[PDB]
Amino acid sequence: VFNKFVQVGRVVYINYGADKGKLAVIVNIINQNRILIDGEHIVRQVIPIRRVHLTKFQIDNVELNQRTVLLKKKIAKFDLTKKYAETSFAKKQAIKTKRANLGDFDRFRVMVLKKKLARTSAKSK
């Protein structure tokens, strides 16, 4: 149903921005198309809600118009870091980052390792 809302103090993913791939929190809703954004890795921004994706992390400790500092603290106490880090989303994301850094030999390896996973399964026993 509707469980995940855009609320004062929401945990949001910044996509399609200079800030893409970065989590943030929402202090105020400016009109219906824009929210006010903050976090440890991001300046205080205004962003069209369009560019953002709701993360299903709601921090009820956050307060309307909270100063950058206090927010950063509350965020830290919440472990957006650990919690998000376990997410299927961030797991996949990191895996991607991994694939990013691979050289000719790395690929080749992965290919021989890929062939083996195939041709070897008959090892019952």
Partner: protein
């Protein structure tokens, strides 16, 4: 645009947009096949689009109706006229472009198997405010007397049923191979790859 043959599933696609895309693709060398044309969408009252198609039925070559325009009533051809409209179709180049496109209603034999594709920008859900009016092509071609709607439905159901077979088999076995992937010998290699940046 470089895949050897794209096959698009026109369902829930908007006519004009799917049109322009397929048109460009065509101009630039992509050989396309569109399917399930009867499933394409148009923005407006089914009424309004019937008014419109009627208005078109009304145009004709005066002294000799059997010269020039043929008013085609099947969804396939509706779409086809749509695309031909967006190419320079009297140009030899335009011709080629056209020859690249083939279109059907429902999903005919050669195309059961090949993977059907979607143009994201062309989707009714993507393009149209939810509460605004729309039609499915086959409804229009109904009002204009294309008789095959019922048949196509039946035929589609038939093919849906073959799908459940494919899929189910594919699932069963593909779970069994994932289970035996968790066995010792291979669990090793799995770990090797994960570390490798799976």
């Amino acid at each position: 645009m470089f895949d050897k043959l794209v096959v698009i599933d026109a369902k829930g696609h908007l006519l004009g947009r799917l049109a322009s895309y397929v048109a460009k693709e065509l101009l630039s060398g992509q050989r396309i096949v569109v399917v399930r044309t009867e499933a394409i969408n148009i923005s407006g009252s089914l009424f309004r689009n019937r008014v419109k198609f009627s208005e078109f039925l009304n145009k004709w070559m005066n002294h000799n109706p059997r010269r020039g325009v043929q008013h085609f009533r099947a969804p396939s051809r509706i779409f086809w006229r749509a695309v031909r409209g967006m190419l320079p179709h009297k140009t030899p180049k335009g011709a080629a472009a056209l020859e690249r496109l083939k279109i059907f209603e429902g999903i005919p034999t050669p195309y059961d198997r090949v993977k059907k594709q979607v143009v994201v920008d062309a989707l009714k859900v993507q393009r149209l405010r939810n509460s605004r009016p729309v039609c499915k092509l086959g409804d229009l071609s109904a009002s204009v007397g294309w008789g095959k709607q019922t048949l196509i439905e039946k035929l589609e159901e038939k093919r849906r049923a073959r799908a459940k077979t494919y899929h189910d088999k594919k699932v069963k076995q593909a779970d069994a191979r994932k289970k035996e992937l968790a066995a010792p010998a291979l669990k090793a290699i799995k770990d090797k790859l994960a570390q490798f940046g799976y």
